[PDB]
Amino acid sequence: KVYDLSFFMPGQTIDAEEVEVPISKRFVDKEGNVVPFIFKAITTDRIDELEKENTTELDSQRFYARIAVETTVYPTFKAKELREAYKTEDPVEVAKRVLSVGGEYANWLNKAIEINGFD
Ligand SMILES: [Mn+2]
C-alpha cells in the first residue's frame, strides 16, 4: 500500500528542542534573575563517536560528561572564555568548576541524558 516516507525527512520531521532549565540559583543576571541553562539534544551519530572516543572498556563517567557538555548550548563549557577563566582546557573540568555544588553537577548530567531521550 505504498508507504509515505515524506514524514521522516528533513523537510518535515520536527526538530529537537532547545530547552531552558534553571540548573542552579547561583547564576543570576544584572537584575537578580536566575540564568537557566539551555539544552539541546545532540545527534545519535554524535553519541556514537563519543562512545567510541571513550572506549578501550568504556569510561562512562567521561562519556556521559562529554554528552552533557555538548548537549548544553548555554553555557557551553568549551568556550575559550570559560577555559581561560577557570584555568583548564578540559570542558568537563570547566563544568565541574562551574557547577561546584555536587547536586548541581549531578542534576546537570541527568538533565542532559534526559534531554537526549535516554530513559
Ligand atoms: Mn529584578
UniProtKB/Swiss-Prot annotation:
InterPro entries: XkdN-like, XkdN-like_sf. Disulfide bonds: none annotated. It comes from the Bacteria. Coiled coil: none annotated. To B.subtilis XkdN. This is Uncharacterized protein YqbN.
